[PDB]
Amino acid sequence: CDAFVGTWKLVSSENFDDYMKEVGVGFATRKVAGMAKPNMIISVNGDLVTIRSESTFKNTEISFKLGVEFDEITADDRKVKSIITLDGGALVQVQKWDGKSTTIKRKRDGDKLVVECVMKGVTSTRVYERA
Structure with a gap:
């Protein structure tokens, strides 16, 4: 929550x-x-x-x-169902649609916001900076 409020641009x-x-x-x-x-x-x-x-x-x-x-x-x-929780200062999101599921995690690292997207072992990392 307050570590995250602001405006961010993909880097x-x-x-x-x-x-x-x-x-x-x-x-x-x-x-x-x-x-x-x-x-x-x-x-x-x-x-x-x-x-x-x-x-x-x-x-x-x-x-x-x-x-x-x-x-x-x-x-x-x-069209999906989602739930978002905090774990140790990260926001974790789980999306569910017909027997499938993905997780998107957002955490701060330095002055950056890091988002890790995971579907069956394939992970993607996107890094944002304050705009």
Whole structure:
């Protein structure tokens, strides 16, 4: 929560095409999504956190309370169920859709925000810096 509020800009990506191929995203969608260089805006108002991502591909926004299940439809049109929790100062997100599952973890490292995306052993790392 307060370590994260602010505005952030993507600075590097590693293995995002292979992670997206594992999640099941189609050729054309992986191509235009892998070119995007997003800006993430995170805020807290009492009990509620909001994460907004703004991009040349799609703009996205989710609002939630920690530990409580919600519906989300992702930038690539998968309709899923998610839960977000804090573990040792990291936010962990689990997305579930028809027998599948992924985890997206966000933690601070120095002045950076690090996001690790995992689907069956394939891991992708994206690093953001304060804009």
